[PDB]
Amino acid sequence: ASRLYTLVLVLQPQRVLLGMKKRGFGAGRWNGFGGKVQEGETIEDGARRELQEESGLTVDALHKVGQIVFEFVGEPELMDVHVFCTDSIQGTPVESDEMRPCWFQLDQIPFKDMWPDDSYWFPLLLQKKKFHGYFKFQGQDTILDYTLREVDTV
Ligand SMILES: Cc1cc(-c2ccco2)c2oc(N)nc2c1
């Protein structure tokens, strides 16, 4: 009962790019860039497309860094989120009516205004670790339970 999604973090040695979504799912939080994977598209090509569509950047190499399954209690469909990072981009982030991108220094990551799971796995991403996670939410603000482990391959 799972649907594929991508999430891409643009992570340079001293800063990370995040976007504030204006509407829809996740509005009002900072997050990486991503969305649903399409019919006939690989997960990685989906990740590249969503980065490009939502941020305006052009990405060359993407690196798999994690997989997180999200459950919302009562909702049948699980979100199977494939997480990628890149430090090899072209262009400048573009603010649109849907998305406002902003660079953050690594010691000023805005965890209080991000999805609450990010506090758990972002520190792993920043230390170049790979991970498998599962988070069970009740509504959008409450983590009921979770698992998170480091892995050598995603
Ligand atoms: C429930 C949930 C979903 C997503 C998501 C959907 C599509 C891409 O990511 C999240 O992203 C983060 N950082 N927490 C998240 C929680």
- Candidate of 7, 54, 78, 121 to mutate for ligand 1, largest count of ligand atoms within 8 Å of Cβ: 7
Handedness of CA 120, 143, 74, 22 (dihedral sign): negative
Check if 50 has its Cβ closer than 6 Å to any atom of ligand 1: no
**Structure determination method:** X-ray
**150 in a labelled binding site:** no
Name the superfamily (CATH) of residues 1-154.
Nucleoside Triphosphate Pyrophosphohydrolase (3.90.79.10)
**141 in a labelled binding site:** no
Residues 141, 138: Cα–Cα separation, whole Å: 7
DSSP character at residue 7: E
Structure resolution in Å?
1.5
SS3 141: coil
Which residues, 6 or more positions from 47, have their beta carbon under 8 angstroms from its beta carbon? Answer: 6, 7, 8, 34, 62, 82, 84
**97 in a labelled binding site:** no
Domain boundaries, the chain: 1-154
How big is the chain, counted in residues? Answer: 154
The identity of residue 74, as a single letter, is G
